[PDB]
Each structure stands twice: as structure tokens, then as C-alpha cells.
Enzyme design. Sequence first.
Site, PDB file in Angstrom:
ATOM      1  N   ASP A  34      -6.034  -3.658 -15.008  1.00  0.00           N
ATOM      2  CA  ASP A  34      -6.592  -4.198 -13.797  1.00  0.00           C
ATOM      3  C   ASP A  34      -8.121  -4.236 -13.893  1.00  0.00           C
ATOM      4  O   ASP A  34      -8.794  -3.259 -13.631  1.00  0.00           O
ATOM      5  CB  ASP A  34      -6.178  -3.313 -12.652  1.00  0.00           C
ATOM      6  CG  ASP A  34      -6.662  -3.839 -11.317  1.00  0.00           C
ATOM      7  OD1 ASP A  34      -7.378  -4.860 -11.255  1.00  0.00           O
ATOM      8  OD2 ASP A  34      -6.376  -3.260 -10.285  1.00  0.00           O
ATOM      9  N   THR A  35      -8.660  -5.405 -14.213  1.00  0.00           N
ATOM     10  CA  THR A  35     -10.110  -5.512 -14.372  1.00  0.00           C
ATOM     11  C   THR A  35     -10.854  -5.428 -13.029  1.00  0.00           C
ATOM     12  O   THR A  35     -12.057  -5.264 -13.037  1.00  0.00           O
ATOM     13  CB  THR A  35     -10.505  -6.811 -15.044  1.00  0.00           C
ATOM     14  OG1 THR A  35      -9.910  -7.902 -14.329  1.00  0.00           O
ATOM     15  CG2 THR A  35      -9.919  -6.915 -16.476  1.00  0.00           C
ATOM     16  N   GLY A  36     -10.158  -5.558 -11.908  1.00  0.00           N
ATOM     17  CA  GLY A  36     -10.772  -5.424 -10.589  1.00  0.00           C
ATOM     18  C   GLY A  36     -10.729  -3.993 -10.068  1.00  0.00           C
ATOM     19  O   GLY A  36     -10.998  -3.743  -8.867  1.00  0.00           O
TER      20      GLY A  36
HETATM   21  C1  LIG Z   1      -6.888  -8.957  -3.982  1.00  0.00           C
HETATM   22  C2  LIG Z   1      -5.399  -8.693  -3.697  1.00  0.00           C
HETATM   23  C3  LIG Z   1      -4.708 -10.020  -3.449  1.00  0.00           C
HETATM   24  C4  LIG Z   1      -4.730  -7.778  -4.754  1.00  0.00           C
HETATM   25  N1  LIG Z   1      -3.295  -7.705  -4.535  1.00  0.00           N
HETATM   26  C5  LIG Z   1      -2.376  -8.425  -5.172  1.00  0.00           C
HETATM   27  O1  LIG Z   1      -2.586  -9.260  -6.050  1.00  0.00           O
HETATM   28  C6  LIG Z   1      -0.977  -8.196  -4.689  1.00  0.00           C
HETATM   29  C7  LIG Z   1      -0.109  -7.484  -5.713  1.00  0.00           C
HETATM   30  N2  LIG Z   1      -0.414  -9.497  -4.387  1.00  0.00           N
HETATM   31  C8  LIG Z   1      -0.037  -9.794  -3.160  1.00  0.00           C
HETATM   32  O2  LIG Z   1      -0.526  -9.328  -2.142  1.00  0.00           O
HETATM   33  O3  LIG Z   1       1.021 -10.757  -3.008  1.00  0.00           O
HETATM   34  C9  LIG Z   1       1.450 -10.988  -1.654  1.00  0.00           C
HETATM   35  C10 LIG Z   1       2.582 -10.089  -1.204  1.00  0.00           C
HETATM   36  C11 LIG Z   1       2.949  -8.930  -1.900  1.00  0.00           C
HETATM   37  C12 LIG Z   1       4.001  -8.127  -1.427  1.00  0.00           C
HETATM   38  C13 LIG Z   1       4.710  -8.491  -0.266  1.00  0.00           C
HETATM   39  C14 LIG Z   1       4.343  -9.652   0.420  1.00  0.00           C
HETATM   40  C15 LIG Z   1       3.292 -10.445  -0.046  1.00  0.00           C
HETATM   41  C16 LIG Z   1      -5.183  -6.339  -4.727  1.00  0.00           C
HETATM   42  O4  LIG Z   1      -5.691  -5.855  -3.736  1.00  0.00           O
HETATM   43  N3  LIG Z   1      -4.893  -5.627  -5.822  1.00  0.00           N
HETATM   44  C17 LIG Z   1      -5.370  -4.289  -6.124  1.00  0.00           C
HETATM   45  C18 LIG Z   1      -4.253  -3.298  -6.486  1.00  0.00           C
HETATM   46  C19 LIG Z   1      -2.868  -3.554  -5.945  1.00  0.00           C
HETATM   47  C20 LIG Z   1      -1.790  -3.733  -6.832  1.00  0.00           C
HETATM   48  C21 LIG Z   1      -0.498  -3.949  -6.348  1.00  0.00           C
HETATM   49  C22 LIG Z   1      -0.296  -3.966  -4.964  1.00  0.00           C
HETATM   50  C23 LIG Z   1      -1.377  -3.790  -4.088  1.00  0.00           C
HETATM   51  C24 LIG Z   1      -2.655  -3.570  -4.574  1.00  0.00           C
HETATM   52  C25 LIG Z   1      -6.234  -4.310  -7.367  1.00  0.00           C
HETATM   53  O5  LIG Z   1      -5.408  -4.735  -8.438  1.00  0.00           O
HETATM   54  C26 LIG Z   1      -7.430  -5.254  -7.289  1.00  0.00           C
HETATM   55  O6  LIG Z   1      -8.029  -5.335  -8.573  1.00  0.00           O
HETATM   56  C27 LIG Z   1      -8.492  -4.745  -6.333  1.00  0.00           C
HETATM   57  C28 LIG Z   1      -9.644  -5.723  -6.413  1.00  0.00           C
HETATM   58  C29 LIG Z   1     -10.688  -5.336  -5.410  1.00  0.00           C
HETATM   59  C30 LIG Z   1     -12.029  -5.216  -5.827  1.00  0.00           C
HETATM   60  C31 LIG Z   1     -13.003  -4.858  -4.890  1.00  0.00           C
HETATM   61  C32 LIG Z   1     -12.621  -4.627  -3.556  1.00  0.00           C
HETATM   62  C33 LIG Z   1     -11.281  -4.743  -3.156  1.00  0.00           C
HETATM   63  C34 LIG Z   1     -10.310  -5.104  -4.082  1.00  0.00           C
HETATM   64  N4  LIG Z   1      -8.973  -3.434  -6.724  1.00  0.00           N
HETATM   65  C35 LIG Z   1      -8.850  -2.361  -5.945  1.00  0.00           C
HETATM   66  O7  LIG Z   1      -8.313  -2.384  -4.851  1.00  0.00           O
HETATM   67  C36 LIG Z   1      -9.441  -1.090  -6.483  1.00  0.00           C
HETATM   68  N5  LIG Z   1     -10.441  -0.601  -5.540  1.00  0.00           N
HETATM   69  C37 LIG Z   1     -11.664  -0.392  -6.031  1.00  0.00           C
HETATM   70  O8  LIG Z   1     -11.902  -0.455  -7.223  1.00  0.00           O
HETATM   71  C38 LIG Z   1     -12.753  -0.096  -5.029  1.00  0.00           C
HETATM   72  C39 LIG Z   1     -13.660  -1.302  -4.884  1.00  0.00           C
HETATM   73  N6  LIG Z   1     -13.568   1.015  -5.429  1.00  0.00           N
HETATM   74  C40 LIG Z   1     -13.553   2.196  -4.841  1.00  0.00           C
HETATM   75  O9  LIG Z   1     -13.077   2.443  -3.750  1.00  0.00           O
HETATM   76  O10 LIG Z   1     -14.190   3.257  -5.594  1.00  0.00           O
HETATM   77  C41 LIG Z   1     -14.360   4.526  -4.981  1.00  0.00           C
HETATM   78  C42 LIG Z   1     -15.383   4.416  -3.880  1.00  0.00           C
HETATM   79  C43 LIG Z   1     -15.442   5.422  -2.917  1.00  0.00           C
HETATM   80  C44 LIG Z   1     -16.396   5.339  -1.894  1.00  0.00           C
HETATM   81  C45 LIG Z   1     -17.287   4.264  -1.840  1.00  0.00           C
HETATM   82  C46 LIG Z   1     -17.223   3.262  -2.817  1.00  0.00           C
HETATM   83  C47 LIG Z   1     -16.277   3.341  -3.845  1.00  0.00           C
HETATM   84  C48 LIG Z   1      -8.423   0.011  -6.809  1.00  0.00           C
HETATM   85  C49 LIG Z   1      -7.171  -0.587  -7.468  1.00  0.00           C
HETATM   86  C50 LIG Z   1      -9.038   1.099  -7.684  1.00  0.00           C
END
Ligand SMILES: CC(C)[C@H](NC(=O)[C@H](C)NC(=O)OCc1ccccc1)C(=O)N[C@@H](Cc1ccccc1)[C@@H](O)[C@H](O)[C@H](Cc1ccccc1)NC(=O)[C@@H](NC(=O)[C@H](C)NC(=O)OCc1ccccc1)C(C)C
Lengths: 99, 99
Positions: B25-27
Site C-alpha cells: 500500500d503506497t498510500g
Molecule cells: C481512498 C480509499 C478509497 C481507500 N479504500 C479503498 O480503496 C477501499 C478498499 N475501496 C472501497 O472503499 O470500495 C468501496 C466499498 C468497499 C466495501 C463495501 C462497499 C463499498 C482507502 O482508504 N484505503 C486505505 C486502507 C484500506 C484498505 C481496505 C479497506 C479500507 C481501507 C489505504 O489503503 C489508503 O492507502 C489510504 C490512503 C490515504 C492517504 C492519506 C489520507 C487518507 C488515506 N491510507 C491510509 O488510510 C493510511 N493512513 C495514513 O497513512 C495516514 C495519512 N497517516 C497517519 O495517520 O499516520 C499517523 C498520524 C498520526 C497523527 C497525525 C498524523 C499522522 C493507513 C492505511 C496507514
Amino acid sequence: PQITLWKRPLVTIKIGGQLKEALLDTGADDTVLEEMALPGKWKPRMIGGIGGFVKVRQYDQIPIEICGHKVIGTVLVGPTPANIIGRNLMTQIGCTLNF
Amino acid sequence: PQITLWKRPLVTIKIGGQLKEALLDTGADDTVLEEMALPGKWKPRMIGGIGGFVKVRQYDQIPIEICGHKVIGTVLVGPTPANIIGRNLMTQIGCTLNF
Ligand SMILES: CC(C)[C@H](NC(=O)[C@H](C)NC(=O)OCc1ccccc1)C(=O)N[C@@H](Cc1ccccc1)[C@@H](O)[C@H](O)[C@H](Cc1ccccc1)NC(=O)[C@@H](NC(=O)[C@H](C)NC(=O)OCc1ccccc1)C(C)C
């Protein structure tokens, strides 16, 4: 380009005549952009992430230029904290993970 | 391997003697795994995603084998809906985005 991952893989996108930075996000099925004026119709959709969901607007067949590659696809617009380029568009620019 | 992104880039990881599938997961800055018995100490941490913010347990210097590459790093454990291999570990296996 080859992009290592020591940093967030940010790219500059052009969409709806606007320049944005977006994260190339292999963990994103879909492409999700911050609130932005896009022209045209949409459908309500929900995406799930870590912790929550968010309601988004689904726009189909939107032109986007991602790091100089013009692609056209579905773009979700809503209260995301980052512009995210998902696999839906990364496939269209031929983006692979390699190790 | 070269991994295209027509599908979720899932890999098989070994951690704490257990086999799991995880998303490259590059995000994702960090690596977040579903609830699992890890040995040792931890610190409470929070990660933010789309929609919400989950409390996780931060484990430092944990051995993980990701698609046959042994690395050691920080692993977050909490109520994530997917095991996610973030950039912190992807860098250690030399994983790049390419297009
Ligand atoms: C952008 C979305 C569409 C994405 N979700 C999807 O693609 C999902 C699977 N698809 C989807 O939703 O299909 C529709 C659906 C699914 C099921 C039922 C009905 C309908 C997503 O949020 N995906 C995330 C993980 C995931 C996987 C499976 C299911 C649910 C969630 C990460 O892969 C994705 O890469 C995100 C990208 C991102 C970047 C920046 C901001 C928000 C999101 N990273 C993350 O969510 C990561 N968070 C972070 O990296 C944050 C930014 N950092 C962080 O909090 O660091 C600590 C911190 C603490 C305090 C202050 C600052 C930082 C996490 C996985 C580690």
C-alpha cells in the site's frame, strides 16, 4: 519514472483545468480527490478507509492527466484529507509495483 | 516481482510465525495489521484514514517476511479491515512504483 517509497509517492495531476498533487495509492481501488469543482453529473457513493467511511460524489469518464499521462476514468470527490490516485487510474498509466 | 494494479496488490507475509495476506500500500506511511498476537511491548498510536482515526498498538523492530523478503520494522496492530504493508516496510524490500 521509477518512484521509490522513502517519501509519499506524490504526483501532479491536472483535472478539470486545475493542478493538484495526488498520492499514487496502490491501496486505493478508486481515485478520491478533495472537494473540487468538477463539471457534469454525479452519483452518491461511499468509500471506506481506516476508521470511517465517507460519502463521495462519483464522476464517471473524467479526464485526468497524471504526471503527463492523460487518462480518463472515474473520480470520487469528497472530504478526503489527500488527493488519492487509485488503481483505477494507475492501471491506465501502466503503473506497477516492483521489487 | 513486477506487480500490475488491475487487482489489489496482495502479498503473503509471515509475521509472528503466522501467515497473512497484506496489501502493498503506497498510500500507507505505516504498516497496519489486523488484530494478531504479537509478542513484546507496544505503545498506543493512532492512524488516520479516510473517514476515521483508529487506535493501534505500535510494535517496533518486528520481523516480517514480505513476499520472501525478510525485513524488520514497525508494525501497527488494530481494527483495520485489511492488513496493510506501508512504505515503512516497502522501502526495506526495495519496492518502487514504475510507469
Ligand atoms: C481512498 C480509499 C478509497 C481507500 N479504500 C479503498 O480503496 C477501499 C478498499 N475501496 C472501497 O472503499 O470500495 C468501496 C466499498 C468497499 C466495501 C463495501 C462497499 C463499498 C482507502 O482508504 N484505503 C486505505 C486502507 C484500506 C484498505 C481496505 C479497506 C479500507 C481501507 C489505504 O489503503 C489508503 O492507502 C489510504 C490512503 C490515504 C492517504 C492519506 C489520507 C487518507 C488515506 N491510507 C491510509 O488510510 C493510511 N493512513 C495514513 O497513512 C495516514 C495519512 N497517516 C497517519 O495517520 O499516520 C499517523 C498520524 C498520526 C497523527 C497525525 C498524523 C499522522 C493507513 C492505511 C496507514
